[PDB]
């Protein structure tokens, strides 16, 4: 049996009295088991017979709106009280825990009968309840504030509020919620056949249903565990120089017994060449030429050169393989246009609030005395028009909107865009002159909690939603703030993002048309308030050849040196002239036919190669004139054969050494240019063919046009053995005495056990902030990127077409809790999310399937199917005659399992953010998920967006990777797919540009090993026998780059695709100093070992030596005058310790090795 009934008259305004009715419960009208079904579902079951009726539950639900307001955070505290308020309104065991003391008459205006007013009662309740609500609900966080959300209801402060007195509290009519007060008695057993009221709980820590989450530990901190810690560092340090300061002992022991040792067919075919290029150079010459013009006339039909920055991935690759999925599944990836702003000038800021006393500190950017001036600048950047083909371009035309048809704002992330980028919203102060209520601070601090959320509880009802549609983030938007909470902001970040569309063409320098506008304006710009640095995405571009274009002086001055040096050099006032400026018209006209013949094949010229291989050509292609000449002048003319016999006679000497270096290395190259970074691999053929051509180029070319210097120098008009052989017969022999062996040896292996001691800490990554002009925005950038931000690029994880989203298991894959498996994607994404310094990702995975069930949720009220065609209702419209989508069943509050899931998901991603509901689906999920029209209806690719931390070296983003595709691996295996149909890869905007760096250290030794395994073998086929001589060869071209390695840390030179092409250098160049003394070593007419070496080095060591001097001297003409970095940095140092390096393990280490192990015949 009930108590009461009914609602009596006026209290006070619109507060009523309840009418006194102590007989039978009432049946309940129909019309009202939408309100009893939705507040109190532990009534309806069985028998519908309570003492209520619709209209005490119709004006309830208006008075508990407020801990609506307060409570919605954990439902479990919400449904606690709700339990009670129930019991309250109609339990039908009223007669047990209630006793009416007073009761007041009442006269009624209307029917003239007189009524009862309720006026005082006793209300009998458990204490282990009260206990109970209070452990459940004493920390929950109050919006907007680090404080309780009790301390708001309790009228006081929150720690000294018990139970009871907040209890107690709540019954009062003194807060404005109550009509009248509600007499409590706190027992726990029956007193004087009274049964108070002990109903069943549920802590905050446990569900009252599977779709009930348990409330998540920022809420109640009671059961959650703390923050795992698992990196273990590894241990380094174990080999460092163990094995190389205790590996040079036994060579300073082995090479010390010698101390105590002392206690005792192709001439007859290049001379029968010779002999007709000299017999008749009329004709050969003509040969050359045309030959030459008609091979280098087909670069003018192409000539073509690639500067996208994406050059640094072979098409075929992995990289490129999983950015070609975004061509047709769901579009391209997002351009930035970055401008972060700071304020030195102004000072700090102190906020007090109002009701309660907890004072906040603003930093120097977000006060309104700034805000208006960054408003001003924001709005004046919008408009900012250019002009494509001639026609006006605007930004609206280029920006993306998430959701487009409907309305068309531009997509902008400014902290101002909490503020919807207006004035007049700024200044809404609530309350008189005396003091203020309500403020932007307070409303600021309010949207940076939940950044979704329309309808801000406080004193205004200002939306907190972007002005888009999609919530603007705390993460993109704040710089420099102390890694939780904003308040503490120092940098403003904003964001313009812009649409890319690959397929298309047209339409992209479309964009950047206004881009330089963008920068036009930006750079263009003067403020006494604030400093200001930004970024396009094409500016990252743009500097590189702005950069580009300042060393053709240089370099050009560098050249001439070199043209130069070869007049110079040859001979001892008849001097050997003009055919050094011939020499220099056989190697410029080679190295342009020879990319001339590839530009008609339709390979494009880099831009690394274009300054590399001139090097090369000329630096290999030189050493050909130096040591043939050099030859014929050391060689005197016998008595009864004239100067053709004699030409073919030193050609038939010299060439068949000189066949070798080119032939070995050139087909080196062309065994080498099977690896797939296409850097190197565009490299290697025109390294190879220029030089091949080269080669076959002098001995047409040069040989013929010898004779006419000879015949020139005949007539004795124009246009010894005396300059190096004193020097070198001099310096020659004090080498191989028994008194200096020992020692340029043990040097010279004491510089390899430090090379290979150091191999370990080999750099690598190339550092992107090293790569622009000092004076530039961009370097300023990349010291404030690294310094404010929290939140680098987004990260896509991308699930292919293939599983199920049907049944139990296909959503369990993908779920996200609400009792849910703990190993699914989401879930492993949020794992991994903590452990931030750990694996580089950042933040929550905010994906969409978990906020589909919020929607599909049965008491959303959100979607309305239609009565007759099943047409989506608006959540915004009256609701006259349609109906709930899931029916309000037991059976029906779980997640759909057939068809009807897919039936229901297109209207949620054609739902706009209403404010009677929540965001909906095609604000920020409009692209999220492909649909599939076919057998019914099918889902595409799902892709959950989440953000990196922010990153700053080469260290970091390689170690980015290796993470990412460990946690795709991860749950892959895990998620139990049959076959590889579909996988979960990774994605971002810079996973091309640093996939070929997480294999650099394995293919390197694949490409320099096989390169110097041709060195090996094609020396083999031009010496015939000898073993011995091959291997030795073998040994000073490691032995070289190994130094060449060691000379990489010794300066602190990074190991990447710029770098490995100038590497593979070294194995190409460093023969030509060792074949031309092999050769020479091999075969020469001396019984004792010692002295024949004697006469390699002063017939042909010496030219050879004058073939360097050249590259030395125009070595410092670079650093002279050295204007740019990236070319100082790898193209001066590389060349120095390549010469410097190879020259002294060449002509000075090789020749005491030849006189230890030299072999003979
Ligand atoms: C976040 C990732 C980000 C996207 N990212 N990461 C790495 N990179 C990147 C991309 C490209 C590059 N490159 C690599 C090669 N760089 C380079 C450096 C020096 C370098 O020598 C300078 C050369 C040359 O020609 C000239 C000038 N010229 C004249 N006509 C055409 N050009 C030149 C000079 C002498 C001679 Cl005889 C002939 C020439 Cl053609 O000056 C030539 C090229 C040029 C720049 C770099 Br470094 C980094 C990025 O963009
Ligand atoms: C970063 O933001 C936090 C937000 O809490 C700042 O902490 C607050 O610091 C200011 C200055 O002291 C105050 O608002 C408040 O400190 C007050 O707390 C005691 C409490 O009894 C009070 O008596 C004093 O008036 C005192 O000023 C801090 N707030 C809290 C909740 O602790 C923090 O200082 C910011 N970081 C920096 C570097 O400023
Ligand atoms: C985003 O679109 C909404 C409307 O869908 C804009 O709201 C109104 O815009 C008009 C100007 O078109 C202004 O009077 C106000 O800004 C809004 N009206 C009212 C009554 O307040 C909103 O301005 C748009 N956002 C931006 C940044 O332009
Ligand atoms: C900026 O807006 C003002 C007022 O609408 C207008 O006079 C001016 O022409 C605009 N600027 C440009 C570059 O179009
Ligand atoms: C460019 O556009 C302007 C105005 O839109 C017009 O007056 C002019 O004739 C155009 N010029 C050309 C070459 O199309
Ligand atoms: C926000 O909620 C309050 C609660 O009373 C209401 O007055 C106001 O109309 C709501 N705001 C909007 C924009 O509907
Ligand atoms: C910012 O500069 C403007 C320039 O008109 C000036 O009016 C304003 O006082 C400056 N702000 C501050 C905080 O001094
Ligand atoms: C997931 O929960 C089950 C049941 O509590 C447990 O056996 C399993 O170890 C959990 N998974 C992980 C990865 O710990
Ligand atoms: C992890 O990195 C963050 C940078 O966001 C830093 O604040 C924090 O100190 C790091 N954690 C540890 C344990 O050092
Ligand atoms: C809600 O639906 C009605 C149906 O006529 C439409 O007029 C209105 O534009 C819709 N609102 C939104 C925000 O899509
Ligand atoms: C919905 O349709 C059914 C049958 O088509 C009908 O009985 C019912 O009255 C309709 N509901 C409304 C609110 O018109």
Same mark, same amino acid.
């Given at each position: 049996s009930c108590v009461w009934y009914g609602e009596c008259g006026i209290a006070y305004g619109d507060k009523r009295y309840?009418?006194?009715?102590?007989?039978?419960?009432?049946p309940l009208p129909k019309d009202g088991y939408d309100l009893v079904q939705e507040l109190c579902p532990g009534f309806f079951f069985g028998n519908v017979s309570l003492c209520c009726d619709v209209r005490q539950l119709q004006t309830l639900k208006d008075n508990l709106q407020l801990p609506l307001q307060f409570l919605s955070r954990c439902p479990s505290c919400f449904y606690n009280l709700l339990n009670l308020f129930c019991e309250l309104t109609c339990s039908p065991r009223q007669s047990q825990f209630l006793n009416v003391t007073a009761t007041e008459d009442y006269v009624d205006p209307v029917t003239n009968q007189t009524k009862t007013n309720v006026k005082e009662l006793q209300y009998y309740v458990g204490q282990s309840f009260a206990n109970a609500m209070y452990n459940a609900c004493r920390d929950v966080e109050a919006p907007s504030s680090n404080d309780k959300a009790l301390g708001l209801l309790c009228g006081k402060d929150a720690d000294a509020c018990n139970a009871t007195n907040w209890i107690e509290y709540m019954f009062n009519k003194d807060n404005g919620q109550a009509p009248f007060t509600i007499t409590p008695v706190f027992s726990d057993f029956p007193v004087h056949g009274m049964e108070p009221m002990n109903?069943?709980?549920?802590?905050?820590?446990?569900?009252?249903?599977?779709?009930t989450a348990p409330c998540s530990c920022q809420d109640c901190s009671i059961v959650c565990g703390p923050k795992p810690q698992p990196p273990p560092p590894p241990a380094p340090w174990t080999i460092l120089g163990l094995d190389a300061m205790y590996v040079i002992m036994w060579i300073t022991y082995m090479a010390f017994l010698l101390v105590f040792f002392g206690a005792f067919c192709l001439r007859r075919l290049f001379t029968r060449w010779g002999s007709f290029c000299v017999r008749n150079p009329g004709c050969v010459i003509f040969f050359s030429l045309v030959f030459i013009t008609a091979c280098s006339s087909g670069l003018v039909f192409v000539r073509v050169t690639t500067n996208?920055?994406?050059?640094?991935?072979?098409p075929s690759s992995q990289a490129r393989l999983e950015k070609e999925y975004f061509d047709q599944h769901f579009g391209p990836f997002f351009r930035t246009e970055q401008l972060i702003i700071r304020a030195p000038l102004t000072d700090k800021h102190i906020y007090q609030p109002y009701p309660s006393g907890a004072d906040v500190p603003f930093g120097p950017p977000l006060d309104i005395q700034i805000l208006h001036q960054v408003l001003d600048l924001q709005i004046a950047i919008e408009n900012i028009t250019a002009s494509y083909d001639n026609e006006?371009?605007?930004?609206?035309?280029?920006?993306?909107?998430? !959701? +487009?048809?409907? =309305?068309?704002?531009?997509?902008? !992330? +400014?902290?101002? =865009?909490?503020?919807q980028n207006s004035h007049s919203v700024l200044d809404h102060k609530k309350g008189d002159d005396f003091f203020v209520y309500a403020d932007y601070h307070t409303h600021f601090l309010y949207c940076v909690r939940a950044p979704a959320s329309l309808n801000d509880t406080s004193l205004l009802h200002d939306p907190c939603l972007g002005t888009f549609g999609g919530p603007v983030f705390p993460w993109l938007v704040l710089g420099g703030y102390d890694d939780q909470n904003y308040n503490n902001a120092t940098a403003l970040v904003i964001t313009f993002p812009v649409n890319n569309y690959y397929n298309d063409t047209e339409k992209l320098q479309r964009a950047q048309a206004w881009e330089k506008e963008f920068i036009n304006f930006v750079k263009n710009y003067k403020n006494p308030n604030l400093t200001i640095s930004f970024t396009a995405e094409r500016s990252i571009e743009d500097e590189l050849n702005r950069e580009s274009d300042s060393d053709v002086f240089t370099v050009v001055i560098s050249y001439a040196?070199?043209?130069?040096?070869?007049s110079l050099a040859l001979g001892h006032v008849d001097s050997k002239v003009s055919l050094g400026i011939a020499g220099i018209l056989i190697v410029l006209s080679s190295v342009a036919c020879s990319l001339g013949v590839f530009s008609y094949i339709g390979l494009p010229l880099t831009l690394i190669v274009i300054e590399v291989i001139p090097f090369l050509v000329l630096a290999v292609g030189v050493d050909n004139i130096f040591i043939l000449v050099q030859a014929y002048q050391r060689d005197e003319r016998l008595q009864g054969e004239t100067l053709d016999q004699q030409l073919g006679r030193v050609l038939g000497e010299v060439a068949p050494s000189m066949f070798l270096s080119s032939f070995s290395e050139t087909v080196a190259f062309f065994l080498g240019a099977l690896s797939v970074m296409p850097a190197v691999h565009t490299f290697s053929l025109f390294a190879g063919l220029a030089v091949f051509i080269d080669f076959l180029l002098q001995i047409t070319c040069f040989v013929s046009l010898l004779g006419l210097d000879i015949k020139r120098q005949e007539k004795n008009r124009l246009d010894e053995s005396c300059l190096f052989r004193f020097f070198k017969n001099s310096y020659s022999p004090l080498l191989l005495k028994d008194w200096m062996r020992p020692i340029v040896i043990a040097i010279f292996v004491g510089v390899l056990s430090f090379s290979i001691a150091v191999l370990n800490k080999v750099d690598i990554g190339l550092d992107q902030s090293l790569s622009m002009p000092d004076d530039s925005y961009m370097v300023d950038y990349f010291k404030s990127i690294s310094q404010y931000l929290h939140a680098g690029p987004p990260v896509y994880f991308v699930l292919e077409e293939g599983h199920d989203y049907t049944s139990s298991k296909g959503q369990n894959m993908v779920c996200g809790g609400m009792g849910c498996n703990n190993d699914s994607l989401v879930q492993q994404i949020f794992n991994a999310a903590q452990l931030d310094n750990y694996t580089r990702i950042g933040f929550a995975p905010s994906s969409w399937i978990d906020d589909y069930f919020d929607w599909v949720k049965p008491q959303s009220s959100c979607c309305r199917v239609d009565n007759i065609t099943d047409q989506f209702c608006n959540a915004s419209v009256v609701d006259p005659a349609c109906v709930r989508c899931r029916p309000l069943t037991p059976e029906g509050k779980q997640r759909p399992q057939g068809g009807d899931f897919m039936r229901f998901l297109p209207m949620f991603l054609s739902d706009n953010p209403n404010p009677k509901c929540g965001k909906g689906g095609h604000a920020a999920y409009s692209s999220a998920v492909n649909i599939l029209l076919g057998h019914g209806t099918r889902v595409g690719a799902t892709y959950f967006m989440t953000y990196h931390t922010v990153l700053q070296t080469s260290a970091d983003f390689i170690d980015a990777l290796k993470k990412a595709r460990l946690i795709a691996s991860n749950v892959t295996e895990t998620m139990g797919i049959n076959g590889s149909a579909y996988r979960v890869f990774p994605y971002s905007v810079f996973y091309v540009f640093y996939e070929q760096y997480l294999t650099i250290i394995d293919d390197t030794i694949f490409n320099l090993g096989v390169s110097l395994g041709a060195?090996?073998?094609?020396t083999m086929v031009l010496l015939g026998c000898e073993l011995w001589s091959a291997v030795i060869m073998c040994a000073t071209i490691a032995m070289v780059l190994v130094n060449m390695f060691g000379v990489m840390w010794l300066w602190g030179i990074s190991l990447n695709a710029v770098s490995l092409v100038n590497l593979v250098m070294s194995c190409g160049i460093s023969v030509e100093f060792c074949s031309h003394i092999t050769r020479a070593f091999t075969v020469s007419m001396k019984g004792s070992r010692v002295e024949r070496a004697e006469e390699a080095l002063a017939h042909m060591g010496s030219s050879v030596f004058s073939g360097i001097t050249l590259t030395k001297f125009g070595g410092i003409v670079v650093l002279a005058f050295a204007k740019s970095q990236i070319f100082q940095i790898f193209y001066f140092r590389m060349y120095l310790a390549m010469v410097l390096l190879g020259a002294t393990h060449?002509?000075?280490?090789?020749?005491?090795?030849?006189?230890?192990?030299?072999?003979?015949?």
């Open positions: 309840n009418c006194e009715y102590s007989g039978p419960p009432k109903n069943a709980t549920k802590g905050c820590d446990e569900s009252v249903d599977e779709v996208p920055v994406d050059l640094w991935s072979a006006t371009v605007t930004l609206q035309d280029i920006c993306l909107a998430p !959701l +487009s048809p409907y =309305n068309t704002n531009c997509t902008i !992330l +400014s902290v101002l =865009n909490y503020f040196i070199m043209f130069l040096y070869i060195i090996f073998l094609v060449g002509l000075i280490f090789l020749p005491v090795l030849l006189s230890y192990i030299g072999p003979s015949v």
